[PDB]
Ligand SMILES: *O[C@@H]1[C@@H](CO)O[C@@](CO)(O[C@H]2O[C@H](CO)[C@@H](O)[C@H](O)[C@H]2O)[C@H]1O
């Protein structure tokens with residue numbers, strides 16, 4: 280019995296091109312359309328769902344040859360959804376200068392300039408053997424291939440269409456194939472019974488945008504949706520009171536934040552940014568809106584970093600007196616400052632913002648909410664404060680301090696953070712030295728500079744909750 284699944288989601292990606300879809304809402308869809316060379320075993324080493332041992336997927340085996348090169352032996356007779364066989368040429372193209380990390384590629388895939396490893400051109404040895412190379416040594420290649428940067432695209436078809444058009448009609452090797460995409464509304468995918476792996480267990484999957492969480496909860500209760508995403512702990516008691524429904528919650532390796540358009544004069548200098556940061560009472564927000572289930576990290580520092588996690592690092596500061604001193608020290612004259620939020624695309628975005636407006640009013644800053652619907656984002660020239668999140672997608676502190684906040688990232692490039700010279704030199708250093716006392720200490724200096732400059736303000740790691748019918752035993756919501 281294969282049912283058609285209807286999933287009520289918090290958002291829909293602007294594209295289904297796998298890298299440009301990187302976001303809180305894209306991967307749950309693109310993970311079903313595309314495959315990677317290797318996958319993480321989420322339950323390896325006794326881990327409760329965040330395990331890291333690597334297992335075969337499109338690559339049946341792989342061997343690290345040297346500190347710059349990894350050879351992947353590919354599964355044979357794997358078919359893209361259009362009937363073309365996947366070969367080493369496709370894998371090579373996926374990680375090529377032309378598609379991903381070269382100068383022209385970064386104009387259409389901005390993450391290819393910040394989220395790429397220091398790749399050199401892949402080498403195709405034969406139809407089913409490819410070597411992934413880096414210009415400088417890195418141990419991260421294999422784990423990177425299991426990440427959201429590693430989804431394999433079809434060379435001929437992708438190159439013919441180009442990145443943007445491919446994103447509207449994606450072709451992959453995954454267990455579901457593309458059917459329909461209605462911008463800011465829905466995505467439909469269908470079972471690919473030509474899949475190389477386990478046969479898909481649903482006939483079709485529809486991801487439908489339901490912007491308000493109470494409407495998602497109501498749709499699950501009425502039977503309109505089989506699964507709904509992005510709920511909060513507050514919704515769990517009501518849902519679990521229905522014997523045919525259930526919730527699942529867990530801390531995610533992602534942090535919610537607010538950030539600034541530092542091209543705006545009000546945020547070109549650190550004092551007012553740091554004043555807004557020091558006025559945030561995170562335990563109060565977590566206690567009021569998250570049932571004390573969201574986690575407050577000790578800085579830009581998460582256990583999944585492994586060798587670059589500092590378990591002894593101090594907490595992020597809360598200092599009303601210093602925030603009040605920094606508002607008056609800045610030229611701040613009482614002019615209202617907008618904070619843009621796409622509703623509750625981030626769980627509790629609007630109630631958290633209303634609480635922070637009160638905290639900011641108490642230090643003399645007037646912040647006004649600007650709540651917009653999907654696709655109605657302001658032009659950057661009209662964005663002042665906004666919310667965002669970062670997924671901590673590697674077992675190394677390189678992600679996201681360096682790949683989002685470093686010199687090649689969007690916080691400096693698009694949003695105008697003039698990072699101190701020491702910060703950008705430390706970014707360069709950590710990316711060229713192995714795990715060691717020096718690298719560990721360098722990441723702590725980066726964390727210290729991040730808190731001093733406040734290009735963004737970490738709020739917490741959300742306790743993500745999804746809900747589903749109990750009789751729906753497979754939930755493609757990643
Ligand atoms: O973290 C999201 C980031 C992804 O690049 O962009 C934002 C806006 O700053 O969201 C946009 O992109 C996603 C992914 O395509 C869409 O689903 C959103 O609707 C769009 O606002 C961040 O929220």
Ligand SMILES: *OP(=O)(O)O[C@@H]1[C@@H](O)[C@@H](O)CO[C@@H]1O
Pocket residue numbers: 301302303304667668669670671679683
């Ligand atoms: O949805 P969103 O918060 O904007 O996505 C972020 C993405 O922009 C990048 O920071 C990685 O983490 C999340 O997916």
